[PDB]
Amino acid sequence: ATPHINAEMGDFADVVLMPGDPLRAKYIAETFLEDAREVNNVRGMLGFTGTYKGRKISVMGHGMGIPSCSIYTKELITDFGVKKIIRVGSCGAVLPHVKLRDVVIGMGACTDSKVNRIRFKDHDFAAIADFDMVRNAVDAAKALGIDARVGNLFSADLFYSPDGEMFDVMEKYGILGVEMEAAGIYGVAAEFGAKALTICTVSAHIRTHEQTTAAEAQTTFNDMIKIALESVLLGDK
Amino acid sequence: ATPHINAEMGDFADVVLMPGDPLRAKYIAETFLEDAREVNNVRGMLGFTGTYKGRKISVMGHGMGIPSCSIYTKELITDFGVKKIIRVGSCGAVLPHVKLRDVVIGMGACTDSKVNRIRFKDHDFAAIADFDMVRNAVDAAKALGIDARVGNLFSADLFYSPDGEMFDVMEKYGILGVEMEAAGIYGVAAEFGAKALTICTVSAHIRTHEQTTAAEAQTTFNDMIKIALESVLLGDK
Amino acid sequence: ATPHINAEMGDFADVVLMPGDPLRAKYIAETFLEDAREVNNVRGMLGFTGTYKGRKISVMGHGMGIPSCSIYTKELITDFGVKKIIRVGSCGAVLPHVKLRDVVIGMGACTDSKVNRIRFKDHDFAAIADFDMVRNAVDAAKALGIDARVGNLFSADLFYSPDGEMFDVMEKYGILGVEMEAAGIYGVAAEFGAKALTICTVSAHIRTHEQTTAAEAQTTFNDMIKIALESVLLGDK
Amino acid sequence: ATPHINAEMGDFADVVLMPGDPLRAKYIAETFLEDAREVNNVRGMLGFTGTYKGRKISVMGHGMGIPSCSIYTKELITDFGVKKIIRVGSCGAVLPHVKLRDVVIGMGACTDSKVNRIRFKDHDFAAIADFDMVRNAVDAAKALGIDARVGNLFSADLFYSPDGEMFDVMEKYGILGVEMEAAGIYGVAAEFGAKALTICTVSAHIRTHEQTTAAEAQTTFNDMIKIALESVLLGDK
Amino acid sequence: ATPHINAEMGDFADVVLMPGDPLRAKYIAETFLEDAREVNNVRGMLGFTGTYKGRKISVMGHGMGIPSCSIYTKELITDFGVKKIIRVGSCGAVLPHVKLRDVVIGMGACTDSKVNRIRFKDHDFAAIADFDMVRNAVDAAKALGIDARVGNLFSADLFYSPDGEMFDVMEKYGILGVEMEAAGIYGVAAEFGAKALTICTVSAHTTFNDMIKIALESVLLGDK
Amino acid sequence: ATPHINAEMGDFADVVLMPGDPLRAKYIAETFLEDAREVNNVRGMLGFTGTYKGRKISVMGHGMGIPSCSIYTKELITDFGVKKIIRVGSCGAVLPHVKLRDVVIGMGACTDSKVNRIRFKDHDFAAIADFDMVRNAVDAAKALGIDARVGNLFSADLFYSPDGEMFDVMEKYGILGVEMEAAGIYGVAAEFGAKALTICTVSAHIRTHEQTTAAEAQTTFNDMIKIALESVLLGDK
Ligand SMILES: Nc1ncnc2c([C@@H]3O[C@H](CO)[C@@H](O)[C@H]3O)n[nH]c12
Ligand SMILES: Nc1ncnc2c([C@@H]3O[C@H](CO)[C@@H](O)[C@H]3O)n[nH]c12
Numbered sequence A, B, C, D, F: 001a002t003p004h005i006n007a008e009m010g011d012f013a014d015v016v017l018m019p020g021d022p023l024r025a026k027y028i029a030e031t032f033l034e035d036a037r038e039v040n041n042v043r044g045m046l047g048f049t050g051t052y053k054g055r056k057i058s059v060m061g062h063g064m065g066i067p068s069c070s071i072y073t074k075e076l077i078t079d080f081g082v083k084k085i086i087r088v089g090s091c092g093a094v095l096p097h098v099k100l101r102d103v104v105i106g107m108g109a110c111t112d113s114k115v116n117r118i119r120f121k122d123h124d125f126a127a128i129a130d131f132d133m134v135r136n137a138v139d140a141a142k143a144l145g146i147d148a149r150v151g152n153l154f155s156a157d158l159f160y161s162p163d164g165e166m167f168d169v170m171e172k173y174g175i176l177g178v179e180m181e182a183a184g185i186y187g188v189a190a191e192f193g194a195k196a197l198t199i200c201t202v203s204a205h206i207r208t209h210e211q212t213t214a215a216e217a218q219t220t221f222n223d224m225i226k227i228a229l230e231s232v233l234l235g236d237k
Numbered sequence E: 001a002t003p004h005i006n007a008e009m010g011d012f013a014d015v016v017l018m019p020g021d022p023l024r025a026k027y028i029a030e031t032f033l034e035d036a037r038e039v040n041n042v043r044g045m046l047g048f049t050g051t052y053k054g055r056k057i058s059v060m061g062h063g064m065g066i067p068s069c070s071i072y073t074k075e076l077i078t079d080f081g082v083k084k085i086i087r088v089g090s091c092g093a094v095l096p097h098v099k100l101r102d103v104v105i106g107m108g109a110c111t112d113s114k115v116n117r118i119r120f121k122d123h124d125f126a127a128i129a130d131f132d133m134v135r136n137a138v139d140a141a142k143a144l145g146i147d148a149r150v151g152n153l154f155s156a157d158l159f160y161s162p163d164g165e166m167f168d169v170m171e172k173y174g175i176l177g178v179e180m181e182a183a184g185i186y187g188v189a190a191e192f193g194a195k196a197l198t199i200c201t202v203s204a205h206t207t208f209n210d211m212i213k214i215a216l217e218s219v220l221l222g223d224k
Helices: A022-032 A066-079 A115-119 A133-144 A164-171 A182-192 A214-219 A222-236 B024-031 B064-079 B114-119 B132-145 B165-172 B182-192 B213-236 C022-032 C068-077 C115-119 C132-142 C168-170 C182-192 C214-219 C224-234 D022-032 D066-081 D115-119 D131-143 D165-173 D182-192 D214-235 E024-031 E068-081 E115-119 E131-143 E166-172 E183-190 E207-224 F020-034 F064-078 F115-119 F131-143 F167-170 F181-193 F221-236
Strands: A015-018 A036-042 A047-052 A057-061 A084-093 A103-111 A147-155 A178-179 A195-205 B013-017 B034-038 B047-052 B053-061 B084-093 B101-113 B150-153 B178-181 B195-205 C015-018 C036-042 C047-052 C057-058 C084-093 C104-109 C147-157 C176-181 C195-203 D015-018 D036-038 D046-053 D055-060 D084-093 D102-113 D151-157 D175-179 D195-205 E015-018 E033-040 E047-052 E054-061 E084-092 E103-111 E147-153 E177-179 E195-204 F015-018 F035-041 F047-052 F053-061 F083-092 F104-113 F149-155 F176-180 F194-205
Touching: A015 A022, A015 A066, A022 A036, A022 A047, A022 A057, A022 A214, A022 A222, A036 A057, A036 A084, A036 C104, A057 A222, A066 A084, A066 A115, A066 A182, A066 B064, A084 A133, A084 A182, A084 A222, A103 A133, A103 A182, A103 A222, A115 A182, A115 E015, A115 E047, A115 F104, A133 A147, A133 A195, A133 A222, A133 C132, A133 D115, A147 A182, A147 A195, A182 A195, A195 A214, A195 A222, A222 F167, B013 B024, B013 B064, B013 B213, B024 B034, B024 B053, B024 B182, B024 B213, B034 B053, B034 D214, B047 B213, B053 B213, B064 B084, B064 B114, B064 B182, B084 B132, B084 B182, B084 B213, B084 E024, B084 F115, B101 B132, B101 B182, B101 B213, B101 D102, B114 B182, B114 E033, B132 B150, B132 B195, B132 B213, B132 D131, B132 D151, B150 B182, B150 B195, B178 B195, B182 B195, B195 B213, C015 C022, C015 C224, C022 C036, C022 C047, C022 C057, C022 C214, C022 C224, C036 C057, C047 C224, C068 C084, C068 C182, C068 E068, C084 C132, C084 C182, C084 C224, C104 C132, C104 C182, C104 C224, C115 C182, C132 C147, C132 C195, C132 C224, C147 C182, C147 C195, C176 C195, C182 C195, C195 C224, D015 D022, D015 D214, D022 D036, D022 D046, D022 D055, D022 D214, D036 D055, D046 D214, D055 D214, D066 D084, D066 D115, D066 D182, D066 F064, D084 D182, D084 D214, D102 D131, D102 D182, D102 D214, D115 D182, D115 E195, D131 D195, D131 D214, D131 E068, D131 E183, D151 F131, D175 D195, D182 D195, D195 D214, E015 E024, E015 E068, E015 E207, E024 E033, E024 E047, E024 E054, E024 E207, E033 E054, E047 E207, E054 E207, E068 E084, E068 E115, E068 E183, E084 E131, E084 E183, E084 E207, E103 E131, E103 E183, E103 E207, E103 F104, E115 E183, E131 E195, E131 E207, E131 F131, E147 E183, E177 E195, E183 E195, F015 F064, F015 F221, F020 F035, F020 F047, F020 F221, F047 F221, F064 F083, F064 F115, F064 F181, F083 F181, F083 F221, F104 F131, F104 F167, F104 F181, F104 F221, F115 F181, F131 F194, F131 F221, F181 F194, F194 F221
Parallel strands: A015 A057, A015 A084, A084 A195, A103 A147, A147 A178, B013 B053, B013 B084, B084 B195, B101 B150, B150 B178, C015 C057, C015 C084, C084 C195, C104 C147, C147 C176, D015 D055, D015 D084, D084 D195, D102 D151, D151 D175, E015 E054, E015 E084, E084 E195, E103 E147, E147 E177, F015 F053, F015 F083, F083 F194, F104 F149, F149 F176
Antiparallel strands: A036 A047, A047 A057, A084 A178, A103 A195, B034 B047, B047 B053, B084 B178, B101 B195, C036 C047, C047 C057, C084 C176, C104 C195, D036 D046, D046 D055, D084 D175, D102 D195, E033 E047, E047 E054, E084 E177, E103 E195, F035 F047, F047 F053, F083 F176, F104 F194
16 A cells, blocks of 8 residues: 555554565564464565564565665555564674674664755764663563674665775774664654664674675574564563 | 675676566566576575577666665676666656656766765766667667657655655756666766666656556556667677 | 863772763762762863762763863773763753753764764764663663653754754754753764763753753752762662 | 857857867867857957858857856857857876777766755766767767767866875776866756767876877867767757 | 853953963953953853953953854853954964964964854855954054964864874965864854954963963054 | 966066956056066966066966866966965955945955865865955055955855855855855965965945945946055065
8 A cells, every 4th residue: 555565554563573685574474473474575575464472563574775674664654553663684793702693782873874964954863763672672682691782883875885994983983783774764763753673683794704694694593583572572561 | 696696607697687676577587588597586686597589688676775776786797797787667757748658768867875975085976877878778769669868867865755845956957767776876887897777667757646557557667678678689789 | 180180090980970061060069979079170170079879979060062072071081991971961952742851861962063974984973872871871760750751862063053943853853952062972982982871951942942040050950960870870780 | 248258149059169278269160160250259268150061050168167167158058049068178087998089978077066066955966968969979970980988077176186096086986087177067058958068088197197299189189079060960960 | 141151231341352261261350450350150161351451351261162162152242242252272283383382363264163064055164253353463462572473273173083184184274273163253253243363372283471462452452 | 388377487476466357467467567578378368477666567367266266376386486366356245235346355265166175174174365465455455545345255166056045145144245266266375385365346236135235436446456466565565
């Protein structure tokens, strides 16, 4: 019922988990949710709704990049009643002892995109998550015995940057992970009056050049998913 | 293979057609290509390689927005030997005499993205197509009896833009179509030394709810595909 | 000693409360700290150290504006072993449900200053607080039965802004309070590897025109101080 | 008459060739036009009108820099019925394979000027030539046995630039020639609704300070002028 | 009163000298003025009013940085009738032939602040002093046997630069001194229709009393 | 010789007056100078050297706009030993009380050009004149009974600007005259270590004011040139 999602009101839960990869969304639906059904397939951007421990939950890909996820998050918020979005992504690390498969939680997200400047009269908008969602995720990770670090992400427009020196700048200012969406989702959440959080799994070290495979990212980053799902239940109270 | 493409050198032709929707890529392979073989499916971004009138051709989705297509086009160029990219997409018009189903060829692409400023030391980089490819597309269009306009596209970062007034400015400056990728693909081609072209069909008239029927759009879609494919043959001389 | 603080290592606690007004720092030291002693008076920027429920704590003015507070925060971190800074300030509100004397906690801070762009290669640095410090303040306020909202502040360079329309944009994007330092302190904390939090008391409403007096700001905003001090004790565990 | 041109409607053809140097315009009139008459001498900016193979054609200097040529091109468009402007100039190369005496056709023009950002709400306007004019020029060149390169020029505000590093950037993104006017003329054409093209001959290699001799310059200049003139005849059909 | 100044119209003279440090304002008031009276102490930003050779004169700290002094100068101009602001500060020099202990007069002020771009539609506003005040300061200095250098200051937002990349640039383009306020004060003066001047002593690469004498005598020259 | 000046060291005085129009330079030479001889005619940009009251003085056009005058002033300073440049031009007024034929002295020059930001690492360079030259001009004018206004000029890149509202901003900030060169000349002067000044006569009121524009002054164009020349004589003493 929207230009990029062929579904109707009620087809989505009020909370949506969103990886960039629709195939990871499919994996999550098949692995963590009961009674999951596909609710969207437009442009292959798979979305599903099922239950987790009785709680109605949706998962849907948002694609790669700020412009892509801004489209889906906006539509979910304005036309499907979605109140909370939890991005469950991958990222590259720049810090020396942040390692592969570490879970990072983006309370804020830096960016080299122009979208928030366009929204905010060319000033600095601090793209932040909802505090209660951050807190829920931290508490859930603790209950699960999973380490999770909270801090700044950096949302890049260019996965292949011509400016390698910027990575030293990110490292100097404590950036936990380089991904491509958080700052955009946070801008949309503030623009349209909803709540968002980005949780990422470290899938590459930008310095050491260690990296996981495409298959590993699609189907094995499960700590962040358990954290996300349990954090919703805490939020419900 | 690359982190976003599960294939090896040789799997892709040296020319790749790219719609945003990976389902359109599959449709293109099935409809216009002989002996089509799927060569990528990471993140559901379907890619295929086949032949058109004997000529080896590939077709693969690029996803929505500059950051998404920048990843795929970079990787195709540096790791798969691709020499030419032709985006085949949709766009919205802002000019009165540009009608639904019109074909537009982006000789240049304006943008509100920051990617080319990051590349170009914060100055104005004119994101342009390769001239020969533009000319090949014009001649292929003529031989098919299809009228096409050549000029500027505008590649937006925000499909849902909070700056409605900018559309008046685009109209004032002769922008032929509003889409979300061309300026980024043109930046990648310049950065990595390849050739690119974006052709679009007008599928919407901004500030108006006018829409074409399903059969009309497929017919028009097919016309664009034919122009792109025939243009490659002309380029081969 | 440093160019703006005539004290030696050890004279400051490892946690410093910092209002913009040195006379407020004096009030706080005399009212909340036991055995308080003056440790700075350079440029009349009073700083004191004493104990709160057995915990060594310092309080010192940072003056008005990002450039002023950036000086003091840097010096405390590099030369006095300060690990945490809690700014305890005043702000003006734009949101219709925010009232005079409400306490707001700045998980992030937007800004129209150029300093973070200077630090961050002209990109958007999300100026954020330390998460644990935010949670400690939230928990302390709950234990005290004091209400407090958590979200974005906006750190202005011009208290007398010629751009009145920017306040509508701040309001649309949920800015809780307009002040003049948080984004700068958060940038310094990030640069030098320390932790910071800004808590503000609403001293004016930009829409309803209500306003506390200079005398009230100097001495009567005590809820935010109780929250700050108790949050430190929580932080110590 | 207009503030910088003392002529009347009819004194100029609907196509004007424009070198920067008014003395070069005088040379073009004497050399290529029959029955040439001087139609402007305000500020010494000589313009002439005559015929080339029966076709009415004008030639006039535009002076140095974007601000200068923007004045002349605007006035020609709004007050003298001019439809097409062909800048005929020299440029410096930054690419090793681009050689002295090569003819470059600016299908696009990059710039470090702010004039187009001012016009285009501080976004990226792709300053482009008219496609048919570009094609006419290629075809004309081919007929004359010259292979012209088509791509981006860079229009500089500073002939004596303090930023030597920018040339490396220009080279990396494939800029064919450096001059000082094209992006400005293209901006004017778009703003006031006309068509423009810039053709340049490479008279210098910026990195080595290679410089063309006087005799070879006169030869390549003539080639460029023949190309421009014959392109007009092709456009007429 | 204003939110940052607890005084009333008439408490300030129509010219105010402003050092950054309020304790320096107190020193100035005590050393140079007759019948000096404290007229502001909000936030400890001490302001005083007295006479210098029969001429009513005020002196008040403005704090460090563009945002701080922009507040105080605006309120003085719009709410206390002040017509002229003279900043009397210290600066660091980058030029070889600008000496320690030299007096520099900022006819213009560069800055890495965004405040004037906010004011001037993101274009380049040349933050300048009032010409007559510059002339008066030069002439007052001359009469005191001092050659003041007139030129550009640079007003920094970051005393502690993250990379220090601007220093060589300031030197290349002839900046006389580095401080943290002038361009802000000049922007305020332009915005609200008053006149301002920044005078600095080169404190790095009295003297202080000489600078104050130049500022005070330059006012008396202006009154003529 | 230099790329834009066919002359040798010694041909120019160490002070050069520069109008935009080279024909105006000719007029000044013939009207004001003894034993004037032409020293340059490259690109029709006439320059002359003669004496005024025994004092060796040059006069030469600079063309229109920052890029044009930046070329000439740089070449004069670095290759012809020029120490002082005085632009003598016309400007438009935006202030209601500024009269036609009033003389404006640009102690500073605002601009919408990017050249100084290029020089100054994207920060605000205050483009200022030499103080002694300003003072000499004020005294020279006063001696002739002319009260010259001293303040900011605004140097525009676009004579035909799309942003009419900016003239309101100029008026609000007390801009005395609008022209097209001062900020660029002042930038060159600072870059290459020389001294410069722009003096202008008001030739028009920009835009229509509800108010009444005062009246017209009795001051002439010849009066301004006299001021300029006499200011040189004062500076010599
Ligand atoms: N009116 C419009 N505005 C922006 N983008 C598009 C498109 C294209 O469709 C996608 C978004 O729907 C994206 O790839 C964009 O380039 N079609 N019509 C459009
Ligand atoms: N070399 C220098 N750099 C920056 N600021 C200053 C100052 C002034 O001193 C204060 C900072 O110490 C502030 O008001 C600034 O304008 N003196 N010397 C300086």
